[PDB]
Design an enzyme around this catalytic site. Sequence first.
Site, PDB file in Angstrom:
ATOM      1  CG  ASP A 146     -15.547  -4.435   1.055  1.00 18.42           C
ATOM      2  OD1 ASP A 146     -14.311  -4.861   0.716  1.00 18.42           O
ATOM      3  OD2 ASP A 146     -15.934  -3.453   1.393  1.00 18.42           O
TER       4      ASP A 146
ATOM      5  CG  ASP B 149      -2.229  -0.875   1.144  1.00 20.96           C
ATOM      6  OD1 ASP B 149      -2.233  -2.156   0.273  1.00 20.96           O
ATOM      7  OD2 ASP B 149      -3.274  -0.756   1.299  1.00 20.96           O
TER       8      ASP B 149
END
Length: 220
Positions: free
Chosen positions: A129, A7
């Site tokens: 998700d 990230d």
Amino acid sequence: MIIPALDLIGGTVVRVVRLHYARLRDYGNDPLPRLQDYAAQGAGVLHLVDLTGAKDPAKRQIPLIKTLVAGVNVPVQVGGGVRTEEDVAALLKAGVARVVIASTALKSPDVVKGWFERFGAQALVLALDKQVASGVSLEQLVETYLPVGLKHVLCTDSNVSLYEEVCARYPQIAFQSSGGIGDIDDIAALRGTGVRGVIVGRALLEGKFTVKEAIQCWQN
Ligand code: NA
Ligand code: NA
């Protein structure tokens, strides 16, 4: 397969905890040697998350991405803030192999279905998700993009049972699992569930294990 991930915020390799998210800890500003060693250990796909471009697409870290992409010799996945067709094109022109579509863009299915027809299905990855909270369930998503050849789906967080079902239900979909990886046993758990690709991030940065060990465990 094992898909190492990073990230990035402003070029800094960081760590977050995703919810329905906040930064936790910095790890440095030299992402390429980490990625280069990842590929050296045998990784076949690398995953990148542009958290900067995610909150604002004008600040998309394109220059860093083309740098990291050209720095390795394996296909690279990039996500975060991909909400328009030009963003997909911009990333492809940067050398990116697969683009991860933001859940926000899924509110306009006819627009997204157009991307599949142009760029093809091998260049796009839809993230979930398992559903998007106007709720888009997994089945509803499959029915929407199966006519345009949906192939890659990214599922983000004891869910080994669920992965058994979804992978058995949709044999034409290559599922990617994200999150829930903090130990070498977590990889062994998904080894026979049907998952085609496991994303591993913080466990590598923390030094719990290496990519070489992760692959040997996954391929065992
Ligand atoms: Na692998
Ligand atoms: Na390259």
